[PDB]
Symmetry: D4
Subunit: 164 residues, 8 copies
């Protein structure tokens, strides 16, 4: 009954946001994903946010590049947590997207993650952490993911030792 909603401004963002899809799947957390633009389809974007909110959406994830307005538009229309992911495309290396996502005025928060794929994964994990506050099974899965990454780094470290 709980789910995450992922919106992206362009279908070219799908390359980066697959990381998020993968992450949510791996945790057993249902999500919906749509191509919705604050600039080109403002009415539909707003409609979906209000409908998703009403249908039980726990967290929104928004991905946009350049002058990224998507996250702020969502935040303005719901009081559910909103996570903003700055895309890396364009000549400024996503710096425009980052500043445009994170510098919100007092009153209307957006949670901003790292630029690019790292941010897409972190968006998914953050949503999971928020959800785990009420879902102990998700909380358990988060613990074991960190345990498995540590085993992974240990292996990498043991391999390094042979090469020196």
């Amino acid at each position: 009954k709980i789910f995450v909603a992922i919106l992206m401004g362009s279908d070219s963002d799908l390359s980066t946001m697959e990381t998020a899809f993968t992450e949510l799947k791996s945790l057993g957390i249902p999500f919906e994903a749509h191509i919705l633009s604050a600039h080109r389809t403002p009415k539909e974007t707003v409609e979906f946010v209000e409908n998703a909110d009403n249908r039980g959406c726990a967290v929104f994830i928004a991905a946009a590049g350049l002058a990224a307005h998507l996250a702020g538009t969502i935040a303005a229309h719901t009081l559910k947590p909103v996570i903003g992911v700055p895309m890396a495309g364009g000549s400024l290396g996503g710096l425009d997207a980052l500043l445009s996502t994170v510098q919100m005025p007092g009153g209307v928060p957006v949670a901003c993650t790292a630029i690019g794929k790292a941010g897409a994964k972190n968006a998914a994990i953050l949503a999971a952490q928020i959800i785990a506050l009420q879902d102990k099974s998700i909380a358990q899965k988060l613990v074991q993911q960190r345990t498995a990454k540590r085993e992974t780094l240990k292996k990498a470290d043991e391999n390094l030792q042979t090469q020196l």
Copy 2:
């Protein structure tokens, strides 16, 4: 029955945008000005834009700082030209507001001007230049405004010679 509409997100933007008021008055161009936030009063912002557009608004001017989403929001709900002025408040000196204003994705333009007072003034004049395409009295006034400023500069240059 042709006018310029100026929106700002914050009462504190008035310090800068008064420069714009003074400009349009001195060109005898009528305008409406409102405090409307893309983030705090989104529905009201949208209603006004659609309502002003229908009543003969020729050009929209929008001022905002930090993550400036106002001009982008306006541009998305109208095909009248939208001019964006980045505010200078904040520790990044308005670099965030500039990048967030000008970096619009192809298909939905915003005309961005300089940061702060320079931009406010330039926004008013850009608007006048646009209206001048159809109002010859306006064009006449813009020409004499440029002549008057040349005299002023020569005045200052003559003054400098005595100081040497």
Copy 3:
């Protein structure tokens, strides 16, 4: 039972973070606040975070400037949501703080807000939004808070009309 934990590396951060204290009180959300440095008192910081987590802390908020490592250190030791507020001090306008806070590698997310006082206010509101997923009383207070700020801006707008 549920509370927010605010940490800051320095007492100079209090000027900014009072804004967060104020928002949380207004929403009736219990919080704890401490001076704890990731650099100067790492052991105490880690002991606090782990214990606070165990005691029912739902959200950690961290304030740091310059090379801001505090949020990174908290997130490394808890699976509870962690929000980082970049401080605006130093000759770089807090840009170092922002990049150091937001650019976390995939796997250990930190929710970054705006720089300075706007970010402190938003940290508090985002924390409230997260807690409001499981608390109707808080959900309702966030609604009325946004309603009240809309009324305040409407008033400011009507006020402006007479000043034109």
Copy 4:
């Protein structure tokens, strides 16, 4: 009524072709020239003053690095001037952007986005300005946005099939 497009180098043609396409698709007539503010200052000014008098409604200028072209145009006309920052060089076109937008009060340039996004938006902005007195172009501007929304709807529909 026409739009005049200037660029200071034909390396700028890659980008500015996007603008040509937009104007063509909207049926808006244009002239385009290679004219440098740095290399051909007199010819640049001559053209501007000549184009202006023949009914140029909007100037579009494309320049990179230290982009001075738009500013040079705006100094010599009261027609709207749109500046498009080229993305080339090692600074991601940030130099060009600041060079274009940071005009002093009195002589405005309308700055668009860096690169092709900016080339497309300059064409569309010039069209929005001209549409203030042209039903035909206003109507074309509407249907263009309508078509784009259809494009995004289909993209969304395709995504759902894969989810």
Copy 5:
């Protein structure tokens, strides 16, 4: 037709900074002209003066501008005399825009850019002197003793530093 330096600035607010140049020139004995001339507000007048000064014997042009600094670029576009550009520091970006807008000239039309602000103003004046000193022996000797003098200054300040240790 005497050798002088021409100083242009787009605004009377640039003067507080460019005074430093006047002083440096005044002290090396290099004659100069100075004018408020704007590439944006008075383009015709700016070009007219540049071509006029060039042919009248101007050896070096110094131009000061802030924000989107187009003045040095404009001058260089109309003369083959060396153009020195000094970016002004005002505005919210700390003169970064002025700097990039001054230095990033395409190949073929050079502008010698100096430091932002008063440091730049002084160095422009000294640089103009160094250019002039290839043909003028007295200037060259004045420039040398200038360096002898400051090495003194610093050497003094150094011994002061030792008294406070």
Copy 6:
């Protein structure tokens, strides 16, 4: 006596091999581990405190993006800590450089250049510190500089021919 090199990820090995090579060539012993400040905080701290007690003279840390590794090391030791910012990411390692060098007064981290030059310099700087107590190493540092001077003098003579 030895140098300890830590890095958050295997992908940093690209750059840090450069450090290994310089140390080998100077005959300075070192240990290297993959240890993350974010992913394995306990093990990172446990290792620093251990190496510290077994006579580690200098720590070298490599991290990209939001680099907290060097800072975590310096917080737990009073041995000299050197930070090397990686160039990876869309920001050119600017995030990494500011995140490494801008430490609070009291807990220093010696920052070197971004990328492979910084990796080389971390190794040489460690060697310079150790050479304060070990003359064989000092002599080696001097001979290395003499050699590169030869290389450069050689390259100059070749250029004289290309001219």
Copy 7:
């Protein structure tokens, strides 16, 4: 006769380097300080470096603003560790000084610290940490110094508690 040599290019840097003199005083490390410019007094700058190197200088500390070249010039003439402190004066907040100091090419290292007073204090402590490798009496002071700052922070946290 282990001592630390501090160089600065202008007396205007004394505002800043006082911090380091003190740190070095507290820890009882002998030092020398000079006004010596890489640009203005290059011959004297080189004489002093080689001389002091030969007299047993263990570490050089150099401070410079804007285009900071002093540290690079010192490193070119000795094999002793050289620490660079970037000054924060100027409209670019010492960003020019930072890049100018830290971006040394492979082969000739400079240990760069933070901008301004933070860096100045850190340079002293880093000098101390290098020297302590061969003087446990300094090593001992450095440890007690951290203990003291921790007590300072604890007291500051205690004061915070009373006001909450």
Copy 8:
């Protein structure tokens, strides 16, 4: 015997400075080029600069990337005009090289050109404009170069007209 001296830190910089050799050759201006590092071969660099100065070098050109100190070291040892060219190599796009080259303290000027190839050509041209003050031959060559490039752009504009 008026000549121009070009110094460069690394042979990796030849790629870029060829452009300068070519410009100078085409103008018939005699030049010398040397690999000389301010960091790796300081004594020899200084030896060359003072030697060439006394031999009648009129202008120095210096090329360097990263923390570019070469131009500044030459300037410290001569009163001849020194022209600095920032190399584009490295992850910072040559911004580190630019700031390190142009931000000279008042008293010791360096004339900085643009980053990379453009800068290399402009250094040669600037050197020629300086020399042209005392050599009408070079002056006239400069004039015809400018006339020739206009013909090129004209030809390119005519090509453009065929494509429309």
